[PDB]
Amino acid sequence: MKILVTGAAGFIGSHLCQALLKNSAYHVVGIDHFIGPTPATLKTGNIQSLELNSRFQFIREDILNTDLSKLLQDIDVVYHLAAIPGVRTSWGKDFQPYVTNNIMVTQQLLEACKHIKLDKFIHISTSSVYGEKSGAVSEDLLPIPLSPYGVTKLSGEHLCHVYHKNFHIPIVILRYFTVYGPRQRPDMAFHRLIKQMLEDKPLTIFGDGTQTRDFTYIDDCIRGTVAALETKKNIIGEVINIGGKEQASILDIISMLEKISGKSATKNFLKSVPGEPKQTWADISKASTLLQYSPTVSLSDGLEAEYDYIKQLYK
Amino acid sequence: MKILVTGAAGFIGSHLCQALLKNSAYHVVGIDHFIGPTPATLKTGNIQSLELNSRFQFIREDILNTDLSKLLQDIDVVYHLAAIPGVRTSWGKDFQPYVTNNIMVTQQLLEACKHIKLDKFIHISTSSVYGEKSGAVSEDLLPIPLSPYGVTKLSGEHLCHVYHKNFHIPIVILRYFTVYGPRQRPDMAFHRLIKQMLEDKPLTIFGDGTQTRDFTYIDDCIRGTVAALETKKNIIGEVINIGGKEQASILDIISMLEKISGKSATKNFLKSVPGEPKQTWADISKASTLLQYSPTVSLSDGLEAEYDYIKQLYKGDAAWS
Ligand SMILES: NC(=O)c1ccc[n+]([C@@H]2O[C@H](COP(=O)([O-])OP(=O)(O)OC[C@H]3O[C@@H](n4cnc5c(N)ncnc54)[C@H](O)[C@@H]3O)[C@@H](O)[C@H]2O)c1
Ligand SMILES: NC(=O)c1ccc[n+]([C@@H]2O[C@H](COP(=O)([O-])OP(=O)(O)OC[C@H]3O[C@@H](n4cnc5c(N)ncnc54)[C@H](O)[C@@H]3O)[C@@H](O)[C@H]2O)c1
Ligand SMILES: O=C(O)[C@H]1O[C@H](OP(=O)(O)OP(=O)(O)OC[C@H]2O[C@@H](n3ccc(=O)[nH]c3=O)[C@H](O)[C@@H]2O)[C@H](O)[C@@H](O)[C@H]1O
Ligand SMILES: O=C(O)[C@H]1O[C@H](OP(=O)(O)OP(=O)(O)OC[C@H]2O[C@@H](n3ccc(=O)[nH]c3=O)[C@H](O)[C@@H]2O)[C@H](O)[C@@H](O)[C@H]1O
């Protein structure tokens, strides 16, 4: 089987490409233009491993500025992860790259796939389509995004449904809930908090730090994601939440980091940032049934793997 | 009060400006960049009448290339109608202008409205956000667009909710269902079919013609739209369907046009086009409660009004043609 992974150099993409190459039957093409919030220097580390593997080909081009026909000619399966993420930096003049890379990219990819016989188009979306909800959110709730980021990502999901309904592109949508671990993007909370604690800088807390997330360890994220390809149930057309083992507030995470490091951290409490919910909490009922998905990695184990990664990254 | 109408020279926006200016208390600012499917020639006639009213100011500029600060200073209410419409022409390389003019325009207008104090931001959306649904659809149904056009308009609606929840911009969303009547855009079904019927050319029918729509006569559309400004109900944050008196198939519309025109039309049945639902049908309970909205124009009367308009347009002897 031959698999296209968009955003292959990023946090999740780089890990997905590695998981797929462990199956000797899979050949992987990754495409990534090295844009978004992660500096390109921190991303070439994500893929040095991948380039050595002979069943892996890499293309360093903009999806909007590449021959999509030739790229897709022999592809069985597309994993679409390329996007501009980041809830907090999608306002004012920063919005355009979200529309270009989350809406125009998705539309251009689906236009290239509409006359191709794919087995699956696996589109990666986000808990940020949901906005503020009481309790564990399942995939049938009316999504009302709180951020412009969330809007552009919901717009990509909608494009998948348009091309599925009209051209029978075999879409599956996965909604990730805050992914963490080694190679986590430097604009995310745990990367920032661990780097600040290691440099003896004040920890930046937005709001009161009592906000919670369904933190999903990267290896759990990748198991659900690979499962979306390998499951024997028809999941064509389904939206599936992929969430984590254990929910935690930022205050809780800072305590667990102080226990790993033995350090006492200075908290810097800043203004809340608009467009973030107080709580995310995935119902993973559907991923249970359809993918046999069960997250196994504890926050203490995950947090420590990310801590080690951050120490190695900056030494 | 002072009202800004984006897309003021378009089909609906030109009728809304005309309806608002009948109120001596309303001053209207219209902005329109003369783009989208209607050629700039036919569009100038839409507003002919309006430049005479000294309470009307017309601005011919791109919302993305205009001082929105100067534009919004004195505005009490924004009617946001500017967009690229057309379900059928929203694929492939035609998609980018829908994204620029439906998503980036809405975001940039909401950004400019952050630090003024509107009474209302009345955002015009479409039944195309719902996709294929059975029965009369209410505003709480999960919208799953069938067309790239539908996606861009649903994205505008979500941007309204983001700017509402975060910055208390007092958004109201109206979902129109297929609007027809005098000044209807030349890319729409009735304009095309009437023009083909008038010229004794084959009538272009997509699919078998049994597809139905909630056709909204423009005066009905516009009464619902002014009601969104004038209701004493609190409708801030609400999505409201605006639908028509009578649902009909394309085959039924053609029969009614044959009766108005006295002509026997040749049918050219074409392959159905992607992105179109078989049916649209608004549940207008909400608009009835919240706006006192009740559509009163029959298809027979509305179709005759559009028939006469299309005939007059293509004689090219009226000043406005
Ligand atoms: N990290 C999370 O917690 C999280 C949670 C929910 C959803 N997601 C989604 O998962 C996906 C990956 O997130 P991530 O954290 O790995 O992000 P990332 O920025 O590390 O990786 C995405 C990659 O996409 C690439 N890309 C963007 N636009 C491109 C374009 N036009 N052409 C080619 N390459 C392009 C970037 O260069 C980047 O390397 C995204 O779709 C994101 O929205 C992430
Ligand atoms: N006509 C219908 O049946 C119908 C039904 C549902 C909803 N709608 C919505 O009603 C609104 C009006 O549609 P219409 O049929 O009157 O269309 P129209 O094309 O006649 O009017 C829209 C106007 O917006 C202007 N415009 C577009 N982008 C602009 C920009 N960037 N800056 C300035 N002006 C810009 C165009 O020049 C055009 O005159 C749209 O928002 C459309 O989606 C229409
Ligand atoms: O864009 C993405 O890919 C992701 O964006 C969302 O992830 P988030 O929850 O934003 O992740 P994360 O950056 O770990 O912030 C976590 C918390 O820490 C707070 N936070 C953050 C940084 C900081 O320095 N301090 C702080 O308190 C911050 O206020 C927040 O409350 C989606 O939920 C996710 O599904 C995905 O789309
Ligand atoms: O943005 C817009 O302005 C509108 O786009 C949508 O209007 P539509 O329904 O497409 O209108 P309309 O062009 O009158 O086609 C009606 C029917 O005639 C058929 N049709 C059309 C043309 C033709 O020559 N022959 C034909 O059979 C065609 O197959 C279709 O079934 C939204 O529903 C509306 O809410 C609004 O957003």
XYZ file of C-alpha atoms in Angstrom, chain A residues 17-301:
285
model
C 5.237 8.385 9.070
C 7.497 6.424 11.545
C 4.516 4.271 12.798
C 3.476 3.457 9.159
C 7.047 2.428 8.053
C 7.071 -0.298 10.870
C 4.651 -2.186 8.494
C 7.035 -3.528 5.771
C 4.035 -3.585 3.342
C 3.553 0.289 3.541
C 5.376 2.863 1.317
C 4.976 6.522 2.546
C 5.274 9.831 0.628
C 5.427 12.877 2.961
C 4.941 16.473 1.769
C 5.719 19.503 3.977
C 6.635 23.133 3.152
C 8.100 23.830 6.668
C 5.718 26.686 7.607
C 3.514 27.388 10.679
C 4.602 28.127 14.264
C 7.476 25.526 14.547
C 10.791 26.977 13.240
C 12.087 24.825 10.311
C 15.386 24.143 12.237
C 13.398 22.279 14.990
C 11.546 20.162 12.342
C 14.492 18.642 10.377
C 15.072 16.610 13.637
C 11.502 15.173 13.317
C 12.381 13.545 9.901
C 16.129 12.717 9.855
C 15.125 9.095 10.849
C 12.434 8.978 8.054
C 14.760 10.046 5.131
C 17.079 6.989 5.742
C 14.113 4.561 5.201
C 13.848 3.594 1.464
C 10.028 3.052 1.593
C 9.833 6.866 2.541
C 9.954 9.656 -0.104
C 9.806 13.325 1.055
C 8.763 16.420 -0.979
C 9.518 19.899 0.399
C 6.850 21.880 -1.536
C 3.719 23.953 -0.841
C 0.631 21.769 -1.497
C -0.844 24.881 -3.314
C 2.317 25.119 -5.541
C 2.971 21.430 -6.493
C 1.772 19.025 -9.262
C -0.985 17.255 -7.260
C -1.824 14.954 -10.246
C 1.753 13.445 -10.308
C 1.953 13.440 -6.410
C -1.329 11.349 -6.178
C -0.836 9.104 -9.319
C -0.137 5.830 -7.364
C -1.535 6.792 -3.875
C -3.950 4.346 -2.130
C -4.480 6.391 1.088
C -4.037 10.090 2.018
C -3.391 11.242 5.593
C -4.138 15.004 5.521
C -2.370 16.715 8.532
C -0.924 19.828 6.754
C -2.439 22.936 8.392
C -1.682 26.113 10.362
C -2.607 25.250 14.009
C -2.660 27.538 17.078
C -5.899 28.758 18.718
C -4.320 31.932 20.151
C -2.665 33.515 17.016
C -5.606 33.274 14.474
C -6.894 36.956 14.973
C -6.544 40.118 12.826
C -3.722 39.955 10.191
C -2.701 36.420 11.355
C -6.017 34.897 10.028
C -5.120 34.763 6.257
C -2.540 31.900 6.549
C -5.264 29.830 8.413
C -7.710 30.284 5.477
C -4.970 29.624 2.829
C -3.492 26.511 4.471
C -6.589 25.037 6.245
C -9.319 25.813 3.595
C -7.616 26.377 0.168
C -5.091 23.475 0.733
C -7.903 21.033 1.718
C -10.054 22.089 -1.281
C -7.077 21.774 -3.719
C -6.154 18.290 -2.312
C -9.768 17.047 -2.565
C -10.029 18.496 -6.164
C -6.857 16.440 -7.054
C -8.362 13.279 -5.371
C -11.963 13.515 -6.787
C -11.145 11.541 -10.039
C -8.617 9.098 -8.291
C -9.551 5.667 -6.755
C -8.292 6.134 -3.128
C -9.132 3.455 -0.513
C -9.216 6.232 2.183
C -8.858 10.004 2.662
C -8.129 10.437 6.420
C -8.575 14.125 7.313
C -7.125 15.331 10.643
C -9.282 17.917 12.446
C -9.422 19.264 16.007
C -11.438 19.440 19.268
C -11.393 23.238 18.513
C -14.385 22.781 16.106
C -16.576 22.074 19.261
C -16.135 25.314 21.328
C -17.346 25.419 24.979
C -19.333 22.278 26.009
C -20.415 20.748 29.358
C -19.265 17.087 29.654
C -17.686 14.572 27.232
C -18.379 15.783 23.600
C -19.367 13.206 20.954
C -19.243 13.581 17.193
C -23.047 14.354 16.727
C -22.943 17.695 18.686
C -23.493 20.928 16.654
C -19.897 22.269 16.473
C -19.697 26.041 17.220
C -15.989 27.068 17.106
C -14.710 29.654 19.666
C -11.642 30.627 17.575
C -10.962 31.593 13.976
C -8.569 28.574 13.931
C -11.527 26.285 14.818
C -13.649 27.895 12.074
C -11.024 27.207 9.329
C -10.597 23.600 10.569
C -14.402 23.006 10.581
C -14.445 24.478 7.008
C -11.910 21.720 5.985
C -14.211 19.005 7.519
C -17.164 20.487 5.556
C -15.097 20.418 2.290
C -14.429 16.684 3.013
C -18.248 16.076 3.282
C -18.849 18.038 0.002
C -16.294 15.905 -1.956
C -17.447 12.623 -0.233
C -21.146 13.305 -1.111
C -20.506 14.544 -4.686
C -17.428 12.510 -5.841
C -17.424 9.521 -3.386
C -13.953 10.473 -1.989
C -13.737 7.872 0.871
C -13.231 10.435 3.692
C -12.746 9.713 7.382
C -12.440 12.637 9.841
C -10.427 12.314 13.081
C -10.754 15.076 15.699
C -7.637 15.180 17.888
C -7.793 16.552 21.456
C -4.599 18.499 22.579
C -1.733 16.163 21.553
C 1.542 16.194 23.591
C 4.840 14.299 23.898
C 8.206 14.333 22.129
C 8.382 16.787 19.155
C 5.367 18.765 20.536
C 5.299 22.184 18.747
C 7.081 24.991 20.684
C 3.895 27.207 20.765
C 2.029 24.513 22.818
C 1.608 24.680 26.605
C 3.791 21.728 27.742
C 6.755 22.650 25.435
C 6.613 26.280 26.693
C 6.102 25.329 30.414
C 8.937 22.700 30.383
C 11.343 25.086 28.506
C 10.541 27.933 30.978
C 11.007 25.637 34.032
C 14.407 24.396 32.610
C 15.648 27.982 31.821
C 14.469 29.097 35.359
C 12.026 31.593 33.697
C 8.542 32.307 35.138
C 5.903 29.815 33.837
C 3.393 31.663 31.556
C -0.155 30.767 32.702
C -3.085 32.208 30.669
C -5.979 32.942 33.037
C -6.023 31.169 36.410
C -4.504 27.834 35.193
C -7.674 25.867 36.270
C -8.607 25.269 32.549
C -8.472 21.513 31.719
C -7.747 19.547 28.536
C -8.162 16.001 27.294
C -4.347 15.678 26.774
C -3.589 12.874 24.275
C -0.147 11.344 24.345
C 1.317 11.247 20.817
C 1.762 7.413 20.774
C -1.999 7.038 21.674
C -2.884 9.631 18.929
C -0.808 7.635 16.374
C -2.382 4.238 17.407
C -5.930 5.656 16.819
C -4.734 7.264 13.551
C -3.108 4.062 12.113
C -6.247 2.190 13.352
C -8.368 4.473 11.032
C -6.495 2.906 8.065
C -6.277 -0.711 9.373
C -9.763 -1.186 10.962
C -11.959 -3.822 9.184
C -15.176 -1.833 9.906
C -16.343 0.598 7.154
C -15.733 4.048 8.755
C -16.102 5.956 5.411
C -17.945 9.226 6.141
C -17.439 8.992 9.976
C -16.162 11.759 12.321
C -14.220 10.060 15.206
C -12.910 11.808 18.388
C -9.335 10.756 19.407
C -8.818 11.761 23.096
C -6.482 10.930 25.978
C -6.060 8.726 29.089
C -6.252 11.500 31.788
C -7.606 15.114 31.881
C -5.583 17.745 33.845
C -5.609 21.486 34.586
C -2.417 23.495 33.738
C -1.895 23.910 37.560
C -1.950 20.066 37.864
C 0.592 19.747 35.000
C 2.946 22.337 36.652
C 2.916 20.218 39.921
C 3.724 17.033 37.949
C 6.610 18.859 36.147
C 7.987 20.141 39.528
C 7.920 16.472 40.685
C 9.890 15.344 37.578
C 12.441 18.251 37.778
C 12.526 18.731 41.598
C 12.359 22.488 40.783
C 10.099 25.106 42.391
C 8.707 27.216 39.479
C 7.693 30.924 39.564
C 4.151 31.206 38.136
C 3.474 34.260 35.887
C -0.370 34.606 35.567
C -1.339 36.530 32.380
C -4.671 37.708 30.867
C -6.939 34.942 29.444
C -6.600 34.700 25.611
C -9.914 34.906 23.657
C -11.158 31.863 21.696
C -10.088 29.097 24.143
C -12.586 26.887 26.020
C -12.252 26.297 29.846
C -12.500 22.525 29.263
C -12.123 19.908 26.494
C -13.315 16.333 27.140
C -13.710 13.746 24.331
C -16.324 11.002 24.288
C -14.161 8.175 22.788
C -17.179 5.693 22.667
C -17.105 5.763 18.816
C -13.274 5.351 18.527
C -13.688 2.405 21.015
C -16.298 0.605 18.771
C -14.884 1.461 15.296
C -11.051 1.480 15.828
C -10.600 -0.607 19.072
C -9.064 2.684 20.353
C -7.937 2.746 24.012
C -5.438 5.388 25.231
C -2.891 3.688 27.580
C -0.178 6.343 28.327
C -0.428 8.114 31.716
C 0.256 11.868 32.040
C 3.273 11.157 34.356
C 4.886 8.828 31.723
